[PDB]
Design a protein around this nucleic acid. Structure first.
Ligand SMILES: [Zn+2]
Lengths: 67, 171, 52, 148, 191, 121
RNA sequence: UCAUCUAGACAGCCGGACGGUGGCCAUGGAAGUCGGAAUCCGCUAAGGAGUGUGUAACAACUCACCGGCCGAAUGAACUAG
């Protein structure tokens, strides 16, 4: 037989990851993560939906499965 | 509070024996103009023989960040007073602007050394223009090629006091 | 007399230890701090007193 | 067949070594004194070769001994056991001669090096009228040919 | 300091198969099988190429990345224990009274009994954990061998047999009597 | 300081490669310093013996790779404890001396590089 | 605050750890290791006129130094939450 593990992948944060702004002034639009500041916050930009380029805490966005 | 950076330029009051004093300039992180001018006179009383009654302030101008959407690494040199003595520290912060970097610096010193705003002196803050001059591991960790990491254990705060299913912490 | 090798093997567990000066704990011979909480993990250690 | 080496002040334990070889202590001492004659006043390494009947004594060359001999020394009784600090003239030729005498025995690295080592051996001797021993050895290339 | 990614590797030989659902590890090899619950340690496993498995922790503290190398060593010990096995040799040490060790059966449970340790009338019985086989070795005087797959079970049984022979109310640097483990290794050592 | 000593090593090695066409790679195991010293003295006239950290040497050869390209072939052989003998004498005479001297209970010549050609010998 | 560091660092194994020279005084002896001073060369990749064990003195063993494996940060002293 062959070795079996449960992979348990989830939604890595990196550049090009599409996120949905959960709360704030945008509050429901899509953005793309441009760069990673630190463990808790990232620089995003949402230029089609009208989200200005900004640094934002990761607790205010939800990561989508889109990359 | 939420900090802003100002340049404050001042001088001594002109006398007949010496008109045109030398117009000293300093960069202050402060909440507003009043606190900025107070900190300016505080550091000039630490440096030169002048005080507010004997001098005047010729200009105060807010300096906002040149590229507020570039991610920088800043090295910050700081004096602080502990409970037994005075120490110098160098901390470096990866952040998007100078005022936010010194805000996280003030939070970091208050959290890790119980140092207050009255005890912290900001010697200087400067952007590190080149990588591999970064000397701290906690910021050198985020400079690697294709940095990616997951966020385990998602907790979603609820609006209702009762939930009708067992929640999941998948992200 | 036991045997020389067997005395060495028994003394490995009984005699080649260290003693904490504060709480008398029997410690590994290459240890630097005591493993006990009551002495505060002190580094005051001495060798266990041999015969002869 | 058997060689025994001892450092002996001249003019003279020895018995303990002699008993193994079954050789009279007095006979050995006389032979040694005979050899060390050159400078019994100073300690020196003596080689005794045993033929299973008798032991032949020779003085093996030693840098310290040769250097001490080179420094001119008034004979000392040693009853005084004084410090007897040794002060010496430059004796550049003597040291070069000593290096040549060593003849790179025991593989000294170079003829010049053998001399430099000989100079170092004069930790005890002043080895110069006005200089630290071998201080100028690096500075001056003179006498490199002489050592060879 | 919140190390955001630390990661260890375990090598899987040709004979074994490792099955990891949530944090329950099952290792199956030639000598048998072993299992381990690891739901207390909070890591993540990832099979790379059916002979390599990476174990990782993200955003971990100092204690947490210590536990990562600990759990790597535990699962690697399990793999090498089901491939090569584990063998502990212990020696009997006495001055005057010879230690007489046998195997008895109260209600079919394979007890190891120890008689005449320093001449006492008390009989010391240590139970035997399952999966551990005990052989009184020939051709070396006064030597007992405990073998098995689980290093935990074998070394714990050896330690129980060592601790059951402790001397009371005497200078133990002079009264060195006991049963002490002299060798730890594999059943198929130098394979 | 450390780098300065290191820089000198790089330079001398380059000079040695240029100076002698014949190169002998010698592996030393359990050879005493005294044993080594005697060998050096015997071969002082016709041979140069160089000992160095391998990591240091490999970088040097790569650094000097543009000139003397054939020396690149020596790099696979450099792995393991090694010493470099640079000699005017073409081959056997040097080899015979190295193996014979100081065998006690042991120098061995692992490979020979001469004129861009490698010989197992 | 000092140092080391992909020209290979710190742990762990393995190998060498040498000659002048038993350096000079002093001792019944003390040869790196009872002490007093000096503490320098050669060969070096590297090895102290010695870090300990060590013998009457030796001999012997180990060190701090350099090397193969390892490939990346680590050691000492100090400060304060
Ligand atoms: Zn204690």
């Amino acid at each position: 037989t062959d070795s079996i593990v449960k992979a348990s992948n989830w939604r890595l944060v990196e550049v090009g990851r599409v996120v949905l702004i959960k709360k704030g002034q945008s509050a429901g639009k899509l953005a793309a993560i441009v760069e990673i500041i630190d463990q808790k916050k990232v620089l995003i930009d949402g230029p089609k939906a009208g989200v200005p380029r900004q640094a934002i805490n990761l607790g205010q966005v939800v990561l989508t499965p889109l990359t | 509070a939420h900090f802003k950076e100002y340049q404050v330029i001042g001088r001594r009051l002109p006398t007949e024996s010496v008109p045109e004093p030398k117009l000293f300039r300093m960069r202050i992180f402060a909440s507003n103009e009043v606190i900025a001018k107070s900190r300016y006179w505080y550091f000039l009383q630490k440096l030169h023989k002048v005080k507010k009654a004997s001098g005047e302030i010729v200009s105060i101008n807010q300096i906002n960040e040149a590229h507020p959407t570039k991610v920088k690494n800043f090295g910050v040199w700081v004096r602080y007073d502990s409970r037994s003595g005075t120490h110098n520290m160098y901390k470096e912060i990866r952040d998007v602007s100078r005022v936010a970097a010194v805000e996280t610096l003030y939070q970091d010193m208050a959290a890790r050394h119980r140092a207050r705003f009255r005890s912290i002196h900001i010697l200087k803050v400067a952007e590190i223009e080149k990588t591999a001059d970064v000397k701290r591991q906690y910021v050198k960790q985020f400079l690697t090629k294709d940095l990616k990491f997951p966020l385990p254990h998602r907790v979603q705060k609820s609006t209702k006091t009762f939930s009708y299913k067992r929640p999941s912490t998948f992200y | 007399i036991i045997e020389p090798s067997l005395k060495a093997l028994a003394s490995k567990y009984n005699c080649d230890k260290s003693v904490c000066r504060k709480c008398y704990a029997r410690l590994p011979p290459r240890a630097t701090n005591c493993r006990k909480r009551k002495c505060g993990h002190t580094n005051q250690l001495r060798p266990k007193k041999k015969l002869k | 067949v058997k060689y025994l080496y001892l450092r002996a002040v001249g003019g003279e334990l020895a018995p303990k070594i002699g008993p193994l070889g079954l050789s009279p202590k007095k006979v050995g001492e006389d032979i040694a004194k005979a050899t060390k004659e050159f400078k019994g006043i100073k300690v020196t390494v003596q080689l005794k070769i045993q033929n299973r009947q008798a032991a032949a004594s020779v003085v093996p060359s030693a840098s310290s001994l040769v250097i001490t001999a080179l420094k001119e020394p008034p004979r000392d009784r040693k009853k005084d056991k004084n410090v007897k600090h040794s002060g010496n003239i430059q004796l550049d030729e003597i040291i070069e001669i000593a290096r040549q005498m060593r003849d790179k025995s025991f593989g000294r690295t170079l003829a010049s090096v053998t001399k430099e080592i000989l100079g170092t051996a004069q930790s005890v001797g002043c080895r110069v009228d006005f200089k630290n021993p071998h201080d100028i050895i690096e500075g001056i290339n003179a006498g490199e040919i002489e050592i060879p | 300091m919140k190390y955001i990614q630390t990661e260890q590797q375990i090598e899987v030989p040709e004979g074994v198969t490792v099955s990891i659902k949530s944090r329950i590890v099952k290792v199956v090899g030639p000598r048998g099988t072993l299992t381990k619950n690891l739901k207390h340690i909070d890591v993540t496993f990832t099979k790379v190429n059916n002979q390599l498995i990476k174990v990782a922790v993200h955003n971990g503290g100092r204690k947490h990345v210590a536990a990562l190398r600990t759990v790597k060593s535990l699962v690697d010990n399990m793999i090498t224990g089901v491939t090569k096995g584990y063998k502990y040799k212990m020696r009997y040490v006495y001055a005057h009274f010879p230690i007489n060790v046998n195997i008895v059966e109260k209600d079919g449970a394979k007890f190891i009994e120890v008689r005449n340790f320093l001449g006492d009338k008390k009989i010391r019985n240590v139970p035997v954990r399952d999966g551990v086989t005990i052989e009184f070795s020939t051709n070396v005087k006064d030597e007992i061998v405990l073998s098995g797959n689980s290093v935990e079970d074998v070394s714990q049984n050896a330690a129980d047999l060592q601790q059951i022979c402790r001397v009371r109310n005497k200078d133990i640097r002079k009264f060195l009597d006991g049963i002490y483990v002299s060798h730890k290794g594999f059943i198929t050592e130098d394979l | 300081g450390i780098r300065e000593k290191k820089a000198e090593y790089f330079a001398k090695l380059r000079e040695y490669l240029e100076e002698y066409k014949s190169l002998f790679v010698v592996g030393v195991d359990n050879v005493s310093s005294q044993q080594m010293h005697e060998v050096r003295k015997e071969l002082r006239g016709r041979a140069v013996v160089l000992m160095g950290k391998n990591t240091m040497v490999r970088r040097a050869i790569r650094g000097f790779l543009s000139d003397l390209p054939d020396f690149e072939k020596l790099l696979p052989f450099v792995k393991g404890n090694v010493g470099f003998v640079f000699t005017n004498e073409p081959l056997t005479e040097i080899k015979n001396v190295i193996v014979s001297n100081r065998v006690a209970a042991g120098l061995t010549v692992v490979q020979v590089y001469d004129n861009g050609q490698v010989f197992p010998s």
